[PDB]
Design a protein around this ligand. Sequence first.
Ligand code: HEM
Ligand code: HEM
Ligand SMILES: Cc1cc(N)nc(COc2cncc(CNCCc3cccc(F)c3)c2)c1
Ligand SMILES: Cc1cc(N)nc(COc2cncc(CNCCc3cccc(F)c3)c2)c1
Ligand SMILES: C[C@H](O)[C@H](O)[C@H]1CNc2nc(N)[nH]c(=O)c2N1
Ligand SMILES: C[C@H](O)[C@H](O)[C@H]1CNc2nc(N)[nH]c(=O)c2N1
Ligand SMILES: [Zn+2]
Lengths: 405, 406
Amino acid sequence: KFPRVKNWELGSITYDTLCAQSQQDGPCTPRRCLGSLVLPRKLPAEQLLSQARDFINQYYSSIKRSGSQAHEERLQEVEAEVASTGTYHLRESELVFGAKQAWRNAPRCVGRIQWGKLQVFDARDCSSAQEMFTYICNHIKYATNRGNLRSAITVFPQRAPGRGDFRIWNSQLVRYAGYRQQDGSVRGDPANVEITELCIQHGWTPGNGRFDVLPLLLQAPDEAPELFVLPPELVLEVPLEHPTLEWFAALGLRWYALPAVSNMLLEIGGLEFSAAPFSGWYMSTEIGTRNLCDPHRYNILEDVAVCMDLDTRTTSSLWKDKAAVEINLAVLHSFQLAKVTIVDHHAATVSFMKHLDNEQKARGGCPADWAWIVPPISGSLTPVFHQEMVNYILSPAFRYQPDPW
Amino acid sequence: GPKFPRVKNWELGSITYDTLCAQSQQDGPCTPRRCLGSLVLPRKPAEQLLSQARDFINQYYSSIKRSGSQAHEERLQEVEAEVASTGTYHLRESELVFGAKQAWRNAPRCVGRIQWGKLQVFDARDCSSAQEMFTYICNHIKYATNRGNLRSAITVFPQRAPGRGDFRIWNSQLVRYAGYRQQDGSVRGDPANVEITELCIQHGWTPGNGRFDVLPLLLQAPDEAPELFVLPPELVLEVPLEHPTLEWFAALGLRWYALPAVSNMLLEIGGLEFSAAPFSGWYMSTEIGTRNLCDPHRYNILEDVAVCMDLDTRTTSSLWKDKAAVEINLAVLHSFQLAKVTIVDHHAATVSFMKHLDNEQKARGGCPADWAWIVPPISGSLTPVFHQEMVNYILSPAFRYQPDPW
Ligand code: HEM
Ligand code: HEM
Ligand SMILES: Cc1cc(N)nc(COc2cncc(CNCCc3cccc(F)c3)c2)c1
Ligand SMILES: Cc1cc(N)nc(COc2cncc(CNCCc3cccc(F)c3)c2)c1
Ligand SMILES: C[C@H](O)[C@H](O)[C@H]1CNc2nc(N)[nH]c(=O)c2N1
Ligand SMILES: C[C@H](O)[C@H](O)[C@H]1CNc2nc(N)[nH]c(=O)c2N1
Ligand SMILES: [Zn+2]
C-alpha cells in the first residue's frame, strides 16, 4: 500500500511510492511503533551480487545510459569479480554517485537540499594511520575553506573478509575533551568523556580547559590505533558573543566551525566503508540548543538565565525558553560576525520543505525521520512540524556501527 | 536481553523494557518496511464483540484483584448470555468508571496522564433527547470549570445500538470560537472551525462577527436531525490575555477559554462504542500560546506580536518567531495565573509525565506514548520528554477518532 502524506498547514496531500524500494526492514511492526528510538536493537555471494546489480542499475539509470553496452559490460565485470574473489570494487565515478545518494537517502538529515553538491575524496589507496591523518587534514582544510564551508566526504578503504576495519575512533573530526573530575562532575564536554579517556590511555597529554580539541585515534586494519594531534591553525573556532548582551562574551564560550562525522559506516552496492568521514555546515540549533543547553552536554542554561537576571525559582517564568533563545541568537550572530557558514532552523527547514517537493517529483517520495527533522526549539514555528513524513531505509546508506574498542 | 522493545533515556542513561505492548490486540499503521508514526490519521458484530468483552471484563476483575473468582466467572456468563440474545450487552456502573479511566490511561497522545486516576465520571446513559444532552453538557461544564479550579470529567451518553442511530455531538469541542469566511478569502476568528461555523448557520444560528464568538452546540439524539443550543455566557469561563511587562499586549484583545473539552471522540470499552462521551481537563499553556495563537493556519498572530515587539521580521535569523512565541506563552501563563484558572506550563507538565512513565513502568511494564505529540511544540529538547524514547501501540479501552456526522 502507498501511504498518503498530508501537510496540515496547507491541506496538501501526496502519496509516497518510493518506500516500495526499501529492501531493509526498520524497527516498527503493526503491533508497535518504535520510531522514536535512536538505535536499532539489532546494531555470502548471492546477496552481495543482487545489491551490486541493483546499485549498478541505479548508476546507469542516473547517467541515463540504462541498458547500454557500457552498462552490460559493467554488470559482467562485477558478476565476474564477486564470482571469484567474493567481493568487487567500485569505479571512482560510481563511488561519487553512491556517496551523494547515501546523503540523499539519510532520513535524519535536514540539509538534504544540498545533496547534489558534495566534494568526494577518494582515499581507498590508504594503508596506514599516517596516510589517514594526511587525508583527514586535507579534508578539513578543504571543507573549512576560510569560513566558506563546503560539503565533503573522504572514503577510506572498504571492509574486507579477512581483516580488521579501517576506523576513526572519534565520533567527529573535531570534538572537545571531557575530563571526569574526582567529585563526579565533568570539565568540558560530557559526551566525550570516554574518548577523552581513550586518548590519555594512548599517551596524549591532556589539558584542563572546557574547549580542548581532542586528538585523533586512527586505526589501520588489526593494528593498535594511533594518536594524531590536529594542527591548531586547521581547526577554525568561533568565539561566542551576543549582539546586545555584553557580559555574554565574558562567559568564554566557543564552538568549532566544522561538523564532521567520522564514526558512521557508508554502504554502497553491498560494499561497506567503515571509515568515510563527512561534513557540511552547522544548523545553529545543533550548537545553541543541544550542545550547549542539553543537561548531559555543557548544560549552560542556569548560568545564562542568572546572567539575564531571570527568575530561576519556577518553571512558569519560562527562563529556560528565554535563555535558550539568546544562546541560539548568540551563535548565529557570532558565526555571521566571523564570516563562517551557518544556517538557522527556520531557513534550514524552509529549504527542507523545498527538498521534499523536489524529491516528490523526482522519485515519488522522500524518507524522513520526523523527530530528527523537526528542530529542538520552536518545532511548530517551523514548517516541518506540520508536515507528515514516511520513514524507511534506502541504499546507498549511512549506518551506525559498533565502537571499535 | 528480553524480546520486548528496549527503551532508553538519553539524558540519564537509564533503560527499561516495555512488556505492556504485548497486551495490544490491535495493529497500528507501521510495518517493518516503513514507519508512519508521524501521521495524525493513518488509514480510513457477533463473535468479535464477545472476545473484546471478555477481555475487558478480565481487566476489570484484575483491577479489583478478583481474577478467577466466582463473581468474575458469573459476570463472564452474564455478558455471554446477554450477547447470546440481544447482539449487545451493558456495563455495570463501576465497570464504566474503570473503563473510562482506563481509556484516558491508554491514550498515547496525552501528556496529562499523571492525572488519570482522578476523573469524575458522569453516567448519562439514561439520556434520551437532544434537550437532555444539553442539560448534561451544562452540568459537566459547571462541574468541570468549578469557578477556575478545574476538574477532570467525562460525561458518557448512551452507547451505539444496533438498528438505532447514534448520539452525536457535532462540535469537536464543547467550547470553540467561530471562524467566518470573508469575501477577501481570509477568515475572521478561528480557521479551524470554518465548517462547524457554516453548519451552525445552516441550522439557524444567527452569527456574530468577532474574532472570539463562542459557537453554539449542535446536538444529535438518535435518528433525529441535530438541534442547536447556545451556551449561557456565564457558564463559559474565559481569560483575557495580558503580558506581565509588555503593557501593550492587553491592548491586542486576545482571549482564550478555560475548558478544553473534546467532544467528538469515540470511547470504546469491551467492544461497546460510546459515540458521545465528551471529556475535559485543564490546558497546558503551549496549546494556547503556541498552537492556537501562532499556527499559520490558526490565529497566526506571530508577525503582529513581533512587530509590536519591534523585532526584525524581514530575516529568519533574528529569531523573531522564537522571541514572540516565548512572550505569547508567558502571557498565556501569566493571565491564567492572575485569573485563578488552572493551567500548567510545558516544563511542569512534561516532568510530571516522566513521573507518570516511572509509575506505569512499575504498574504495567510500559506506557504507550506518541513522541511527536508528547514533546511540546516550543522548547522541545529543553523538556525531559525529548530525550525519552517512547513505544506507541493501541490498547483498549481507548479514545478513537470517528467520521464527522455529516
Ligand atoms: C550542507 C550542510 C548540512 C546541514 C545543515 C545538515 C543538517 C543536519 C542536521 C541538523 C542533522 C541532525 C544532527 C544531530 O541532531 O546530531 C543532520 C544529520 C545527518 N546528516 Fe546532515 N547536514 C548537512 C550536510 C550533510 C552531509 C554532507 C552529509 C553526508 C555526506 C550529511 C549526512 C547526514 C547524516 C547521515 C545524518 C544522521 C546522523 C546521525 O544519525 O547521527 N549531512 N544533518
Ligand atoms: C488534566 C489535565 C490534562 C492535560 C494538561 C492534558 C494534556 C493534553 C495535551 C497537551 C494534549 C495534546 C493536545 C493537542 O495537541 O491537540 C492532550 C491530548 C489528549 N488527551 Fe489530555 N490532558 C489532560 C486531561 C485529559 C483528560 C481528562 C482526558 C480524557 C479523559 C484526556 C485525554 C486525551 C486524549 C484522548 C488526547 C488526544 C486528542 C487527539 O488525539 O485529538 N486528557 N492531552
Ligand atoms: C554532516 C553533519 C552536518 C551537521 N550540520 N551536523 C551533523 C551532526 O551530526 C551528529 C552530531 N552528533 C552526534 C552524531 C551521532 N549520533 C548517533 C546516535 C548514537 C548512536 C549510538 C551511540 C551514541 F552515543 C549515539 C551525529 C553532521
Ligand atoms: C481533554 C483535553 C485536555 C487538554 N489539555 N487538551 C485537549 C486538547 O485536545 C484537542 C485539541 N485540538 C484538537 C483536537 C482534535 N484532534 C483531532 C485530529 C484529527 C484531525 C482530522 C481528522 C481526524 F480524524 C483527527 C484535540 C483535550
Ligand atoms: C529519544 C529521541 O528520539 C532523541 O532524543 C532524538 C530526538 N530528536 C533528535 N533530533 C536530532 N536532530 N538529533 C537528536 O539527537 C535527536 N534526539
Ligand atoms: C504532522 C504531525 O504529525 C503533526 O503536525 C502533529 C505533530 N505533533 C503534534 N502534537 C500535538 N500535541 N498536537 C498536534 O496537533 C500535533 N501535530
Ligand atoms: Zn513506526
